[PDB]
Design a protein around this ligand. Structure first.
Ligand SMILES: CCN(c1ccc2ccccc2c1)S(=O)(=O)[C@@H]1C[C@@H]2O[C@H]1C(c1ccc(O)cc1)=C2c1ccc(O)cc1
Ligand SMILES: CCN(c1ccc2ccccc2c1)S(=O)(=O)[C@@H]1C[C@@H]2O[C@H]1C(c1ccc(O)cc1)=C2c1ccc(O)cc1
Lengths: 226, 10, 227, 9
C-alpha cells in the first residue's frame, strides 16, 4: 500500500504522522540533568512507537521485525529530532521548549560535551543546508527502515527507494537542477552516517550509567544493543 | 516479556 | 586545487590507479587455529595495510590540500571503516566467507575463535552479500571508499571543511556519471546512489562496534590510531 | 605520532 502512494501522498502521510513536541519537567547537577533527559526520552519513546506504525510500509512487517528496527534506530530518531528543532537556535540544543541548553551545561554530565558538540555540529549543518520539514520527515523514516535492515528485506528496500523518489521529488519541486538534486541527496544521506555515530557513542554511555545506577522500557531498548 | 511488543500491538 | 578540475572519468582513473595492493597474511595452516594466533594474524595484516592506506589517502583528490592535522584526523576516524569496506569488497565473490587475504579465507565459525567477533563478522558478511546483490562495481567501490575517508571525520574559522564538501560533491557527480553509463534511468541512478550511501551508515556502525571491543595485541601504529 | 610522520614523507 505504501508503494502505491504518490510522492505528495508520501509527504503528507509523513507530516501528519509527526509526533508532538513534549515538555520536560519544570542550575543543573549530573543526576538532575540525566533525570530530566531520561524522563523526557522515555515519554518520547511512546510517541515514536505510534509514529512508527504510521510510517508507510512499517505495518507490513512482522512484529519481530518492527521490534528489531525500533530497537536499532530509537536513539538516532530521538537525536535527529533533537537536531531538527534545534535549528532555529544556533549554538543551543532544544531538548524541549522549556529545556534549552548550551554546551556549557553539557559538561554537567561527564562525557555529554563530546556528543553535545556533535549534535550542535549536525544542527548547524542542517541550518547551513536550509533543511526543509518535508526533507526531515523523509530522513527520519529512512533511519527507521535502514538502521536495522542488515542485522536481521526486499519490502523494506523498495520502501526505501520510494522515499528516495520522494526526496528527489521534493528537491525538483524546490527548483533544484539535476546536478543539485543528487548532490543534495548525497549530502543529506552522508549526515545519517554521523547520526549513527552519535547514537553509537550515545548507547555506549547508557550502558555505563545503568552500571551503576532508567525506566524498564529504556532498559529493554538498551539491552538490545549489548 | 517485552514492553515494546505491547506498545506496538496497542 | 587540482581536484575540482577533473572530469568524472579522470576522477575514476585517479582512484583506480591509487588502489593499494592486496596483502598476504602470515597464516600458517597447521597451526590449526590458536584462536589467539588469529588476532595476531589480523593485527599484523591490518598494520601492514595501514601503511598502504596512508599512502593511498595522499593520492585521493583533495586530501593533500588539507593540513597535516586534518589529514591525521580524517584517517584516525576512518581507518577501520576503510579496512572494512576493502574486506567486504574482496569478499564479494566468496559467499558466507571473508577474504582477509588471498591465503586467509574465514567463515563464521572460525570467527568464534574470538569472543566478540562473530557479531562484527556477521555484519561484514551481510554487507558483502549486499554488495553482491547490488553487483557493486569497482569504479563505484573506489568512490565509496574515498567518500568514507573525507566524510567520516568532517564533523570531527578555517575553513577547509567547505573544500572537502566540494570534493565530496564531485565524487557524487562521478557516481552518477558511472550509473548513467551503465544504462540506468534517472530514477534508478538516484535510487542506487541512495542505496550505496546508506550502506556507509552500517559500515560506520561496524567500525564503532569494532572500536569498542578494542578499547577493552596491537602495533605501535594501531595503538596511535586508537586514541 | 607515526601517522604524521608517514604522511610527511
Ligand atoms: C545517550 C546519552 N548521552 C550521554 C552522553 C554522555 C554521557 C556521559 C556519561 C554518561 C552518560 C552519557 C550519556 S548523549 O548522547 O548526550 C544523549 C543525546 C541527548 O542527550 C542524551 C539523551 C538522552 C537520552 C536518553 C536518556 O535516557 C538520557 C539521555 C538525549 C536525548 C534525549 C531526548 C531526545 O529527544 C533527544 C536526545
Ligand atoms: C578490529 C576490531 N575487531 C575486533 C573485535 C573483537 C575483538 C575482540 C577481542 C580482541 C579484538 C577484537 C577485535 S573487529 O572489528 O572484528 C575487526 C574487523 C576485522 O576483524 C577485526 C579486524 C582486525 C583489525 C585490526 C586488528 O588489530 C585486529 C583485527 C578486521 C580486519 C582486518 C583487516 C582488514 O583488512 C579488515 C578487517
Amino acid at each position: 500500500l505504501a508503494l502505491s502512494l504518490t510522492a505528495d501522498q508520501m509527504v503528507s502521510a509523513l507530516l501528519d504522522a509527526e509526533p508532538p513536541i513534549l515538555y520536560s519537567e519544570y542550575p543543573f547537577s549530573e543526576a538532575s540533568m540525566m533525570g530530566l533527559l531520561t524522563n523526557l526520552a522515555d515519554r518520547e519513546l511512546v510517541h515514536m512507537i505510534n509514529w512508527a506504525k504510521r510510517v508507510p510500509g512499517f505495518v507490513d512487517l512482522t512484529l519481530h521485525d518492527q521490534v528489531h528496527l525500533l530497537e536499532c534506530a530509537w536513539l538516532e530518531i530521538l537525536m535527529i529530532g533533537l537536531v531538527w528543532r534545534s535549528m532555529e537556535h544556533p549554538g543551543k540544543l532544544l531538548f524541549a521548549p522549556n529545556l534549552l541548553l548550551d554546551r556549557n551545561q553539557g559538561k554537567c554530565v561527564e562525557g555529554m560535551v563530546e556528543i553535545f558538540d556533535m549534535l550542535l555540529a549536525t544542527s548547524s549543518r542542517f541550518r547551513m543546508m536550509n533543511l526543509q520539514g518535508e526533507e526531515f520527515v523523509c530522513l527520519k523514516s529512512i533511519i527507521l527502515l535502514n538502521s536495522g535492515v542488515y542485522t536481521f528485506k526486499d519490502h523494506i528496500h523498495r520502501v526505501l527507494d520510494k522515499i528516495t523518489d520522494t526526496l528527489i521529488h521534493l528537491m525538483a519541486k524546490a527548483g533544484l537542477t539535476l546536478q543539485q538534486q543528487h548532490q543534495r541527496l548525497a549530502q543529506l544521506l552522508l549526515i545519517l552516517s554521523h547520526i549513527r555515530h552519535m547514537s553509537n557513542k550515545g548507547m555506549e554511555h547508557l550502558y555505563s550509567m545503568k552500571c551503576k545506577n532508567l525506566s524498564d522500557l529504556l532498559l529493554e531498548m538498551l539491552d538490545a544493543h549489548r | 516479556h517485552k514492553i515494546l511488543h505491547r506498545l506496538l500491538q496497542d
